[PDB]
């Protein structure tokens, strides 16, 4: 399924690969929450480094609050094309439509997380 018109901004192929790879590392390190509801809670608590969403989430309305919340909290957010690919990156057997990489300033992958953040920020103008 093609990216939903409401899925903005959409990471290109390269940035998608960069994001999914960082997601896999955060999953291994347990620096990751999965699901729209868990993502929301990280934002409400101010512990989200960035938000990842699936552009083929169906129905799309389930995740539409996240861009609003991220703009409110000045947290970078981005869509990747595939919930199936996001799911496996997250280390689970199911599709995942939203994920949040959480704050850890002593993280072994902090620099990879800031590099993704910088790329997303460029998409967000």
Swiss-Prot record:
Resulting phenotype, residue 58 to A: Impairs binding to U4 snRNA, but not U3 snoRNA. Causes pre-mRNA splicing and pre-rRNA processing defects
Gene Ontology molecular function terms on file: RNA binding; U3 snoRNA binding; U4 snRNA binding
Keywords: mRNA processing, mRNA splicing, Nucleus, Ribonucleoprotein, Ribosome biogenesis, RNA-binding, rRNA processing, Spliceosome
Cell compartment(s), UniProt: Nucleus, Nucleolus
One GO CC annotation: U4 snRNP
InterPro entries per UniProt: eL8/uL1-like, H/ACA_rnp_Nhp2-like, Ribosomal_eL30-like_sf, Ribosomal_eL8-like_CS, Ribosomal_eL8/eL30/eS12/Gad45, Ribosomal_eL8/Nhp2
Pfam families with a match to the protein in the record: Ribosomal_L7Ae
SUBUNIT field: Binds to the C'/D and B/C motifs in U3 snoRNA. Component of the U4/U6-U5 tri-snRNP complex composed of the U4, U6 and U5 snRNAs and at least PRP3, PRP4, PRP6, PRP8, PRP18, PRP31, PRP38, SNU13, SNU23, SNU66, SNU114, SPP381, SMB1, SMD1, SMD2, SMD3, SMX2, SMX3, LSM2, LSM3, LSM4, LSM5, LSM6, LSM7, LSM8, BRR2 and DIB1. Binds to the 5'-stem-loop of U4 snRNA. Component of the ribosomal small subunit (SSU) processome composed of at least 40 protein subunits and snoRNA U3.
Its biological purpose: Common component of the spliceosome and rRNA processing machinery. In association with the spliceosomal U4/U6.U5 tri-snRNP particle, required for splicing of pre-mRNA. In association with box C/D snoRNPs, required for processing of pre-ribosomal RNA (rRNA) and site-specific 2'-O-methylation of substrate RNAs. Essential for the accumulation and stability of U4 snRNA, U6 snRNA, and box C/D snoRNAs.
Protein family: Belongs to the eukaryotic ribosomal protein eL8 family.
PANTHER family found in the cross-reference section: RIBOSOMAL PROTEIN L7AE FAMILY MEMBER (PTHR23105)
Protein known as: 13 kDa ribonucleoprotein-associated protein
Species annotation: Saccharomyces cerevisiae (strain ATCC 204508 / S288c)
Organism phylogeny: Eukaryota, Fungi, Dikarya, Ascomycota, Saccharomycotina
